[PDB]
């Protein structure tokens, strides 16, 4: 947790932490977004470290289901440190980072997000959810948002608050 | 198996459908998702993940020319849930139903799944290993599966699941919606 | 033949059968086309299972040499079943399928087409023409169109009518 | 060999030419085809198969700047007959002649073939293995072959075929058309 | 090492900066060059060689949103000198300084080098193997190196070189320009 | 030298010779350029045998630092004979060939150019400069332009005039 909190400027917006996997190892990674209005041509969508199309899908869901008006906004996204983010579980952190920059409201650098985001705005389960809460807890994170359907039949550790969520709107209201 | 899709399906959520696709020789159940919304400015946007961009374009042209859905002025975002790569003719029907579901604002039944190639004249053409697909659907608790009508000839159906043979995309939309 | 005739809706237009090769084995494949007028931007040309550029060439030849006005038409092409069509011999079937959709006139599902199409509208010879007429005959096709220059020095089987052609216009007049 | 091209060549068919190209160490005869027609709407279309798109663009700029053919407002479709992949400098001359033939509406002689790289100042530059190319052309019954004039120095010509050494693209167009 | 850059640097030449990057485990010194000039017609041009096109776009958006440089109406051409491929987060700071130098028409000191990843909120984030980078800079006679301020914790500095830990891109521009 | 001089038409403009490397062997290659005004859309930049982006950079430097107005000019570039030119040292020859076509003034086919060109118009050193002057001399070239900073500590052969240069403007004035 500490290496992310030292790198987070005070009240810096447009970033979020994800618990992702390299092989079978769980890794913490920071997702960053910068949204500003488009001037000419198509709205700019430039990414590094995460798929361009995945970001487009996430921005369409955020507009249609959470009302953020992103169609006329340029978006620049990146994963800190050059970590390749290529799995469904990173959707939520990417969505939160975008909303954070759009809302100009920061996230807490001791919290992290795990979940696939469907086109109906739902937060879908992901694999190896137990290592994710464990790695997030073990490295000193206080709160982790996960798909609530991933919580069924699981033993929560008390070191970290585990917030089960089901929709992107529900997440935005808790976080912002 | 089947309710893991019913537990992930929000109540009355539109624009999704289940396909029985194949990875090697193993049959896999996968959810196709679509988001069709009117274009505001510029050209209509078409973004996909997990399935071929051109295949979706072809399917949308068929749905317009043969099922009357006016998709040329609508943006379309499509994805396969869970990062499953959908790369075979058999997924055409599920993609088409997912698109029609989002366009019609009417949901599909999360205990039903769709299998079939879609031709440019709107016909549902046969696919390989239809038996494993119907079996996998029954195995995992699905109640109904739509399959190519010509795939049924000389085949043994499981008792657990209704198998509806279809021949045209319009016939599917009217039974489903 | 029968597996193609059962899949062909009654009077369904914009499709045709080709006798192509997988390695040294001759295979029957159905080519499909859908032509409708273009609205904005460039005329749409979307393909799967066959090369985009090959279709563009075929559509330019059909306009310049057979008068079909395709420059203001969108075209969607595909090979049924996901079969990759990647050889000169498929030109004729692709051209006929396009003309069938453009003319709104169907082809006979018991007939098939074999030939390379040149830029002057000519039907050029192809390799292993004998297996192609044989495989077409053996699987119950009644008629096959082939390059007439491929017929020189060959023994025709009586099970199938073999129509030697030399130009795309001559083919369109026989078929439509 | 040579008449297999003359038998496939419609009477007075324009926009084609023969090249002696190389696959590994074997020389192959191939027909280059061009279709040049005026643009109706939008930007001029350039579609190719069997030869590099950029190489055709370069050749068309040379033909315009050095041979006066106005190609900027013309669509061009090019292909190599038989699916032969043309990927070497020696094919430039045949491609240029095929383009000029379609533009001028004047045919080439199907018993003639062209070998040479085309420079941006319109010069015909030497190519490798000129002897196998001229020999293969004679072997297969061709009557005339145009080759780079500098490729002839110190070389033994076959008696069966006229070998015309050329130096500029304009010189070729005037001898050929 | 250091003067080979000072000997190649024209007097008062703007738009260049030195980075300590890594090839495998070996640290390499490389010069990043930028050419920022106002757009005359059409959309702003962005051409790069030796470094990722998207990385430069991201860096230019950060410099505009966080350092006030108006780059949306400026063409940008970027390259790494010597054909060195720059493909790691640590080069962000040098690229940003090179861009700001060309935009501000103010040169950098060719005996200084820059190391750091640049975040979208303008922060300078830590990089790997900071010790070899600072050591290689000293080894080759550089007088000053800017590094991520958080990379210094628990590290032994060489006496030969000033090590300036920085935290924001604005702080760097004001110290450097 | 002789094989390049025989292929050079009298007063033919827009070409130049470079001493490049295939592995560790030094090779002579001819770079060609053709610049004409752009009509519609973006100015045409078509290349073969050398990188498209490298040519764009070189044309931007030639405009900003030597005043040649190339932004409204189409450019076609190629290496003679299909030789792949993929190293910093070819910059100078490419720049000279473009300027030659733009200025409508030829280069001498017995001269060659070696050097990387920086964004400030400077001619930067290249590796194995000694083989380059040697191969240029051995094959009968009379003059070679090289980066002057490459000359420090080197023994010049008298068979060939070696012109050390530092800027693209200085080169253009000597050559044109």
Residue numbers in the entry:
A (entry chain A), C (entry chain A), F (entry chain A): 277 to 452
B (entry chain B), D (entry chain B), E (entry chain B): 276 to 452
The authors write:
We report here a detailed structural and functional analysis of the RadA protein from S. pneumoniae, which uncovers several key properties of this HR effector encoded in nearly all bacterial species and in some eukaryotes. All bacterial RadA proteins are characterized at the sequence level by three conserved domains: a potential C4-type zinc binding motif (C4); a central canonical RecA-like ATPase domain (H), including a KNRFG motif unique to and strictly conserved in RadA proteins; and a region homologous to the protease domain (P) of the bacterial Lon protein.
The crystal structure of RadAP was solved at 2.5 Å resolution and the structure of RadAFL bound to thymidine diphosphate (dTDP) was solved at 3.5 Å resolution. In the structures of RadAP and RadAFL, the P domain (residues 290–453) forms a ring with six-fold symmetry. RadAP is structurally related to the proteolytic domain of Lon proteases (LonP), which also assembles into a stable annular hexamer, within the full-length protein and as an independent domain. However, the typical lysine and serine residues of the protease catalytic dyad in LonP are replaced in the pneumococcal RadAP domain by an arginine and an alanine, respectively. Thus, RadAP appears to be structurally but not functionally related to LonP, both adopting the same ring-shaped hexameric architecture. In both RadAFL and RadAp, the hexameric structure is primarily maintained by the extensive surface of interaction between adjacent P domains (940–976 Å). The internal diameter of the P domain (15 Å) can accommodate ssDNA but not dsDNA.
